[PDB]
Amino acid sequence: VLYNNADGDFAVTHLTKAHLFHDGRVQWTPPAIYKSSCSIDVTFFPFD
Amino acid sequence: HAEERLLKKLFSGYNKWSRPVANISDVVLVRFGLSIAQLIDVDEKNQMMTTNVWVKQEWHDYKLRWDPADYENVTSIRIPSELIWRPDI
Amino acid sequence: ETRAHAEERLLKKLFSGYNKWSRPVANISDVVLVRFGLSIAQLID
């Protein structure tokens, strides 16, 4: 999970499928839409 | 592998909605704590405050006890919060 | 003898008595590794 959320999904919600290999290896690749929060520093506007 | 056995044992006949106390007269202690990630927004026109909140809840019951010396010295195991009782705050 | 039959038999075999919430590790003392990475589809806004 991400700690910098702001009114959004904490975790991935699609829960796609994942690959398993015979050796016991597993790979997973879900898409997600995240909404993080930035310390927007606007001094050299617009050359920022 | 021992954690799996402990989990399988302690979820044998544990019910969720049954209030987990020995004697009905006895009560629980729900220690409560609050934490703020960020004061996201304070919309004064609509009088609404959107905050990001960590809620810390602490309690204890009797049915989820075991002996650590019987399972290769394990003391802290995870479980999903969906399967156990949960005081609604 | 088709691939589907073999995969179905394998999936039936390796899901017999497996628990999900059990943290899968060789021993309790040993730790697991999670290789992590991201890719950016598009910078929405």
UniProtKB/Swiss-Prot annotation, chain B:
Enumerate the glycosylated residues. N23, N73
UniProt: Ca(2+) binding residues: V42, E44
Quote the subcellular location field of this record: Synaptic cell membrane; Cell membrane
Subunit annotation? Neuronal AChR is composed of two different types of subunits: alpha and beta. CHRNA4 forms heteropentameric neuronal acetylcholine receptors with CHRNB2 and CHRNB4, as well as CHRNA5 and CHRNB3 as accesory subunits. Found in two major stoichiometric forms, LS (low agonist sensitivity): (CHRNA4)3:(CHRNB2)2 and HS (high agonist sensitivity): (CHRNA4)2:(CHRNB2)3, the two stoichiometric forms differ in their unitary conductance, calcium permeability, ACh sensitivity and potentiation by divalent cation. Cells produce predominantly an (CHRNA4)3:(CHRNB2)2 nAChR.
Q: What does this protein do?
A: Component of neuronal acetylcholine receptors (nAChRs) that function as pentameric, ligand-gated cation channels with high calcium permeability among other activities. nAChRs are excitatory neurotrasnmitter receptors formed by a collection of nAChR subunits known to mediate synaptic transmission in the nervous system and the neuromuscular junction. Each nAchR subunit confers differential attributes to channel properties, including activation, deactivation and desensitization kinetics, pH sensitivity, cation permeability, and binding to allosteric modulators.
The record names the disease as:
Epilepsy, nocturnal frontal lobe, 1: An autosomal dominant focal epilepsy characterized by nocturnal seizures with hyperkinetic automatisms and poorly organized stereotyped movements.
Q: Which family does it belong to?
A: Belongs to the ligand-gated ion channel (TC 1.A.9) family. Acetylcholine receptor (TC 1.A.9.1) subfamily. Alpha-4/CHRNA4 sub-subfamily.
- Please state what the protein is called: Neuronal acetylcholine receptor subunit alpha-4
Full-length numbering of the shown residues: 35 to 123 of 627
